[PDB]
């Protein structure tokens, strides 16, 4: 019993801003994380090998990760 009123400033607006910021970050953070995991699990990284004779590669074929090549 005998509870008092604790006077504090309105935390509704700051909490609303934090909720909006986390939601708008996550809204594209979840798809990009899912995309990176699907790239690394299935497609995967490249394998280093010597240059075949008479064959010149593209410039984007000089890199390892699929996203870097893209």
């Amino acid at each position: 019993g005998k509870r008092l009123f604790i006077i504090k400033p309105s935390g509704f607006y700051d909490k609303r801003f934090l909720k909006l910021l986390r939601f708008y970050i996550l809204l594209t953070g979840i798809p990009v994380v899912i995309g990176i995991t699907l790239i690394n699990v299935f497609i995967g990284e490249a394998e280093l090998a010597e240059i075949p004779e008479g064959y010149v590669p593209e410039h984007w074929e000089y890199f390892k990760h699929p996203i870097s090549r893209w």
């Binding site: 005998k2 509870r3 008092l4 009123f5």
Partner: protein, 37 residues
């Protein structure tokens, strides 16, 4: 010499006003009205 009677009247009025304010600071049993989850 303590207070003047004028100051005593002022202190009594301010004290009863302050006690009314502190009584109003209490919480009714329904407060806070938390929404259902």
């Amino acid at each position: 010499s303590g207070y003047t009677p004028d100051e005593k009247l002022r202190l009594q009025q301010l004290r009863e006003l302050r006690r009314r304010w502190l009584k109003d600071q209490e919480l009714s049993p329904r407060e806070p009205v938390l929404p259902p989850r």
